[PDB]
Amino acid sequence: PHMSVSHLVKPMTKPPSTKVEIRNKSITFPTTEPGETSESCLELENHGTTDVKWHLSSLAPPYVKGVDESGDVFRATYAAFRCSPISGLLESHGIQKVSITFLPRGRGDYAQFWDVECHPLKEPHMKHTLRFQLSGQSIEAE
Ligand SMILES: [Cl-]
Numbered sequence: 001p002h003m004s005v006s007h008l009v010k011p012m013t014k015p016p017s018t019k020v021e022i023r024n025k026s027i028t029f030p031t032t033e034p035g036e037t038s039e040s041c042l043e044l045e046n047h048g049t050t051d052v053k054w055h056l057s058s059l060a061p062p063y064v065k066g067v068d069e070s071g072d073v074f075r076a077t078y079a080a081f082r083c084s085p086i087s088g089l090l091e092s093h094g095i096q097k098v099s100i101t102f103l104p105r106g107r108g109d110y111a112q113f114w115d116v117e118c119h120p121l122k123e124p125h126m127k128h129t130l131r132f133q134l135s136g137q138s139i140e141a142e
Contacts, residue, residue, distance in 0.1 A: 017126035019048035020090070020118050029102040029136030037103045042132060044096045044116065054118035055087040056098065064108040066137075080110050081134045089121060104138030111135035 022042055029038040046052050062076040084099045104110060116130040 015126060016048045016050070017052075017118075017120050017123065018128045019046070020052055020054070020116075020128055020130065021045045021047060022116065022130050022132055025131055026133045026135070027100065029134070032102055032104055032136055032138050034104055034106050034138050034140055037101050038136060039102075040100050042098050042100065044090060044098065044118075044130075046090045046092055046094050048120070049092050050120040050122065051092060052090045052118050053087075053121050053124070054090055054096075054116055056083050056114055056116050057086075059113040059115060062110050062112040064110050067106065067108045076110065078105065080104055081112050083114070090118075100134065102134070102136040104136070107138055107140060109135070109137040 022044060024042060027040050027042065029040060032038040044054060058079075058081075060075070062080045063073050064076050064080075065073045067074055080103060082101045082103070084101075085096075088096060090096050102110070112134050114132050114134065116132070117127065118130070119125070119127045
């Protein structure tokens with residue numbers, strides 16, 4: 001019987017280029033009328049000491065269920081969600097609000113995956129990715 005002298009291997013460390021945070025990876029808009037808009041926001045926060053270049057992009061078009069009685073999920077042919085701004089430079093210790101709108105065109109339950117891509121301005125190779133998801137349903141008022 002003896003004390004262990006072993007350790008878990010640790011081949012990688014998270015560098016300072018990963019110090020950019022979003023607080024919620026999911027927003028669910030309230031139930032929104034077709035053709036009306038609903039509004040929410042997320043924030044990017046740069047906890048590092050460098051200026052960070054960032055850009056948001058959707059990973060695929062919105063996917064929508066409950067459009068008809070088929071039991072199929074469809075892809076929307078339009079941008080049901082919009083983010084503003086979609087790119088920028090975020091200074092050290094800065095917080096950027098991203099305003100997000102949901103503008104359905106018809107009954108359905110909508111969602112979409114997005115990511116934020118960022119890196120320190122001076123080190124474009126030191127990339128960091130943040131996933132978020134958007135969702136909301138559209139029901140007509142009776
Ligand atoms: Cl997807």
